[PDB]
Amino acid sequence: MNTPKEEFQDWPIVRIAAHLPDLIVYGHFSPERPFMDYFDGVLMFVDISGFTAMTEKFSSAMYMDRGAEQLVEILNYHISAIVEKVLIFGGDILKFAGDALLALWRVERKQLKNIITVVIKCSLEIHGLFETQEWEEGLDIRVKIGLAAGHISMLVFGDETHSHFLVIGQAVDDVRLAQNMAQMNDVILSPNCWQLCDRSMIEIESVPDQRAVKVNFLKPPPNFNFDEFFTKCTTFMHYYPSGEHKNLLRLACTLKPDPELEMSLQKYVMESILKQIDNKQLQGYLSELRPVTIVFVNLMFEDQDKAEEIGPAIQDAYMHITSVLKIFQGQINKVFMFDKGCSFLCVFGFPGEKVPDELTHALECAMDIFDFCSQVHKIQTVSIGVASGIVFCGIVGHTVRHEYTVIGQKVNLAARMMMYYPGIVTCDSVTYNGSNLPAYFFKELPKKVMKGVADSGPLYQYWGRTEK
Ligand SMILES: COc1cccc(C(=O)c2nonc2N)c1
């Protein structure tokens, strides 16, 4: 008999798995919401703000009507190469945002030392991709890498139809802190990472007024062979593609249909993405430069360093946020958590869900969320930034590992507003002027110099309907 080869690998469940890390795809969790788990690992945070700051050049008349299509293509060309490096070095890409990606090497405590060496090597090869790279006089095509290691907590929250996850705790805080100390082409180790690493492998230098360190060189011992060392390390990597599947970037490419598993995985993915995965919408429909309103919610916790406390609080906030967003087809695009603020990137006017009075509604929703979350047990401070304008939307990453992402000056502004004006609902000039609302509903704010924002315009507090 004949033996036709090639297993079919293009099932809906595989296409869904592209939008999720192995932490979720291979997770098998209890139904309780919230769900918490605890483990150890090495984290890599790759600052990609250098080439995602491109959103400005692609809004120009020079791109004719194809700014969004050109932007997604060039971003994915560069980001795909970073993803391949992380995946071949055995990492799990957790999440993408406009300005970063976060990757995880989950391992037993005894193996943290050797895995740090692997992740340092990966980081240096990432930098190597961008050595002679630019556009239109501008080698702003470089990255900044922060590494951390130690205890990691995972939180899964949601309802019967939607799920979200976060990694939290000190190593998570550390990796953000490490990456914001980095200059272009740097690899910064968190203080705990430096304490746990194989110091014989690396030459470091001090970071002024910091216990975190900069990797100058990976200079291994005389008898060292990285390839043999990496093969030993794969003993500890549960899902490293191997044997018959050594040619694949992810074991998740081999997932077979399983309705119970697919029911669980689909809850993490937006319905319009599922429509495209089901071949019920054109594959290019979601790449667009689209007017939206960003509602960026930040929740700060009473006891920030307690996972068992913050998980229920985030679940409670989430149940309210989701009910409020449903009323106006608002969507949670991302949830992120670092300086023990949990932040929800909410979007009004995504593709196929654009309501007319987007501005008035975004403000009313912001105030509703603000009032409710302010009364949630263990939530110390709620802060909400509201900004409106043209943003890039699209699926960003590699064919085998990608996520729908929103990128733009208005996303960065709403993020900055919630941090620089804590404890209140703020909005930009577009929102204020557009809203069908009387001027005494607002308070014109002092101008603050905010990181990455230049010419923010006048900013306002949404005070609400009454003096109170
Ligand atoms: C702000 O840019 C990012 C990019 C990738 C991940 C995060 C995150 O904060 C987390 N992702 O999962 N848990 C988190 N915490 C943030």
Side-chain angles (χ1 to χ4, degrees):
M1 290 172 278
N2 297 339
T3 58
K5 61 177 78 65
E6 269 276 55
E7 55 184 282
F8 187 70
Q9 294 176 160
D10 195 28
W11 299 109
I13 197 170
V14 173
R15 295 174 163 205
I16 295 165
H19 287 263
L20 297 173
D22 297 341
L23 187 66
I24 302 300
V25 173
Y26 295 108
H28 67 280
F29 323 131
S30 359
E32 71 244 17
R33 295 297 175 258
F35 173 75
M36 260 144 302
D37 198 14
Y38 305 91
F39 49 88
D40 289 281
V42 181
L43 292 168
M44 175 197 284
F45 200 56
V46 186
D47 180 10
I48 62 167
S49 59
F51 32 102
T52 77
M54 274 196 291
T55 305
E56 284 303 286
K57 77 154 160 164
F58 288 104
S59 53
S60 162
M62 78 184 229
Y63 289 99
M64 287 161 294
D65 289 310
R66 297 185 61 254
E69 293 82 0
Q70 288 238 225
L71 176 58
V72 66
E73 176 184 19
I74 192 57
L75 190 56
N76 288 172
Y77 175 62
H78 289 127
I79 297 171
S80 273
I82 299 167
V83 174
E84 286 212 2
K85 287 283 184 195
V86 170
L87 293 180
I88 290 162
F89 275 78
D92 186 17
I93 291 92
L94 295 187
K95 276 209 212 207
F96 297 88
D99 305 61
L101 62 83
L102 175 65
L104 169 66
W105 282 253
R106 173 180 185 168
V107 72
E108 297 260 52
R109 266 167 201 103
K110 284 170 170 195
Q111 283 314 315
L112 286 170
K113 187 186 195 191
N114 288 334
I115 295 295
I116 290 157
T117 296
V118 170
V119 178
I120 294 167
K121 184 82 183 295
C122 181
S123 296
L124 294 169
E125 289 201 10
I126 293 166
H127 290 301
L129 297 172
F130 303 104
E131 272 168 357
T132 58
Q133 287 247 82
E134 58 157 77
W135 290 130
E136 51 132 292
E137 176 97 56
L139 43 286
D140 200 53
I141 323 308
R142 304 289 189 270
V143 297
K144 306 177 191 191
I145 296 175
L147 304 182
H151 309 310
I152 303 159
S153 306
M154 187 199 184
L155 172 70
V156 179
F157 63 90
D159 59 20
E160 305 90 340
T161 77
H162 302 307
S163 304
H164 301 271
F165 81 94
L166 283 172
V167 289
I168 73 157
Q170 192 64 53
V172 174
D173 304 343
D174 289 349
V175 79
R176 163 130 281 180
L177 293 172
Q179 170 278 141
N180 15 73
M181 289 170 217
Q183 306 307 321
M184 287 300 211
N185 198 85
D186 285 353
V187 176
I188 304 305
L189 313 184
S190 75
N192 197 227
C193 191
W194 170 230
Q195 200 63 230
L196 295 172
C197 80
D198 185 350
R199 299 175 171 195
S200 80
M201 289 302 296
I202 57 169
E203 284 238 308
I204 64 86
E205 63 176 59
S206 288
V207 176
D209 314 321
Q210 297 296 165
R211 289 183 312 116
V213 300
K214 180 183 165 303
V215 175
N216 290 334
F217 301 104
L218 176 74
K219 187 110 173 190
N223 53 0
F224 184 81
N225 188 113
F226 188 80
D227 295 337
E228 296 165 17
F229 171 77
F230 181 83
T231 295
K232 295 193 199 80
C233 293
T234 66
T235 296
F236 306 103
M237 301 170 180
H238 193 341
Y239 306 110
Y240 197 70
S242 297
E244 62 196 358
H245 295 118
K246 75 183 303 302
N247 54 305
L248 294 181
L249 285 165
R250 296 191 70 193
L251 191 66
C253 303
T254 74
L255 278 182
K256 299 297 180 225
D258 180 335
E260 164 156 26
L261 178 55
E262 183 166 318
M263 267 187 21
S264 173
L265 297 185
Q266 81 150 250
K267 292 184 175 72
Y268 292 87
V269 176
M270 276 201 87
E271 280 79 3
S272 56
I273 295 283
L274 296 173
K275 201 175 181 181
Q276 181 190 125
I277 282 173
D278 291 327
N279 300 137
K280 287 189 166 70
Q281 180 173 279
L282 288 161
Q283 297 296 321
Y285 176 85
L286 292 177
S287 290
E288 56 184 327
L289 285 163
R290 196 167 180 84
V292 300
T293 301
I294 306 302
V295 174
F296 222 136
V297 176
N298 188 60
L299 312 172
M300 291 192 286
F301 300 97
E302 285 294 0
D303 185 347
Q304 75 165 65
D305 306 293
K306 262 190 205 167
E308 323 72 56
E309 278 183 22
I310 76 136
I314 294 178
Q315 173 69 204
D316 296 350
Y318 166 81
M319 296 296 290
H320 199 76
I321 287 165
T322 195
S323 69
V324 179
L325 303 178
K326 176 174 172 201
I327 298 159
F328 295 116
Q329 295 98 331
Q331 289 280 165
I332 299 168
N333 180 63
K334 302 288 170 177
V335 187
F336 300 137
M337 175 159 181
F338 286 117
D339 72 291
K340 251 66 119 71
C342 177
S343 71
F344 291 75
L345 199 175
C346 312
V347 179
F348 290 86
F350 259 155
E353 36 205 313
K354 172 85 87 276
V355 203
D357 297 300
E358 174 178 294
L359 304 176
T360 319
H361 297 337
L363 294 171
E364 290 179 346
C365 293
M367 185 57 78
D368 185 328
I369 292 169
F370 179 85
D371 288 337
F372 184 89
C373 297
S374 291
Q375 318 304 323
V376 169
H377 192 41
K378 300 285 167 63
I379 300 188
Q380 188 171 56
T381 299
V382 178
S383 312
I384 309 178
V386 184
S388 301
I390 296 158
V391 305
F392 165 77
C393 309
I395 295 166
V396 169
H398 192 286
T399 304
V400 306
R401 187 75 188 88
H402 53 206
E403 289 178 0
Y404 183 69
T405 302
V406 297
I407 303 163
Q409 289 297 330
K410 294 286 163 158
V411 177
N412 300 346
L413 176 55
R416 292 323 173 177
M417 285 158 64
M418 76 193 180
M419 301 314 299
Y420 284 84
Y421 300 89
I424 68 162
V425 177
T426 58
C427 74
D428 65 2
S429 252
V430 172
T431 305
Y432 169 80
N433 287 119
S435 72
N436 68 233
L437 298 182
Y440 57 83
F441 277 45
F442 300 89
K443 172 197 183 168
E444 187 186 9
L445 291 167
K447 304 183 224 70
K448 284 179 190 182
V449 179
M450 298 187 293
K451 289 222 272 289
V453 336
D455 195 33
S456 74
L459 301 176
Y460 300 87
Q461 172 177 192
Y462 182 55
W463 192 270
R465 326 203 82 128
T466 50
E467 280 317 310
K468 251 272 184 189

